[PDB]
Amino acid sequence: LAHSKMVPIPAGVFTMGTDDPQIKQDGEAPARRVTIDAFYMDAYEVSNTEFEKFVNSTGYLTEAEKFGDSFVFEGMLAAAPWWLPVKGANWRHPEGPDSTILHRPDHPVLHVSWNDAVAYCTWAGKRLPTEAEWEYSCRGGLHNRLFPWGNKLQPKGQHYANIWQGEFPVTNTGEDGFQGTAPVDAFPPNGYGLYNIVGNAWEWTSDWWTVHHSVEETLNPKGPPSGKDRVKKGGSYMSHRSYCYRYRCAARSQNTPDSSASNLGFRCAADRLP
């Protein structure tokens, strides 16, 4: 296991966003050409084991632990009736106090806030990716495709990401092999060597959230200088076409930086190898 390995994301220009937005309120549009300098991206979401190394090293208490609760999806026992603030739910106890991570060390760490993620990545000699870096990486060298691998959800009849199958939120069939999270090295890599960049856990990025984007060409954009929510990308194991169609690289959502949930994790990036 090398679940902290990074891959070189090549220098390039890509179309960020889309002129065919699927969720218009999220500012998926307009499409804009963005230039990204070569950098490194974690091949995997940060796993429980990797996060545990950080916590072992630093003694870090995550915000969910300090707050004493975090959001858990009702189906595994608010923004929606299916989100419950559960006392004692945190990265070590992802569905509450009588859940454990002992059997899922290689699954993505959850209930980590933006601050928690920044703490981890910086500890690791890394940083959060910007939204543009994240999306560029997600797209895996393809232009204007829905998903890291293309435009078909199940290419060649194969599941390519851990999302929801069935009727959300009542029934997750686990057709793709995972009802909750999957190991961080599950599913095929995209063209750049990234695993679970869409689906599995949502992923924090460094950007403040805005829905107002210029069509101006940009270089290594960092997002707006101010905001109240940070950008998260990629969807999760709860995502479905019918209500949270955000397992697309262009998709985007947000949360306040102190937010945590049972479907939200992260991966790091770095300008050079740490």
Binding site: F67, F71, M238, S239, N255, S259, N263, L264
Partner: peptide, 5 residues
């Protein structure tokens, strides 16, 4: 898709 705290 995720509630804010």
């Amino acid at each position: 898709c995720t509630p804010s705290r």
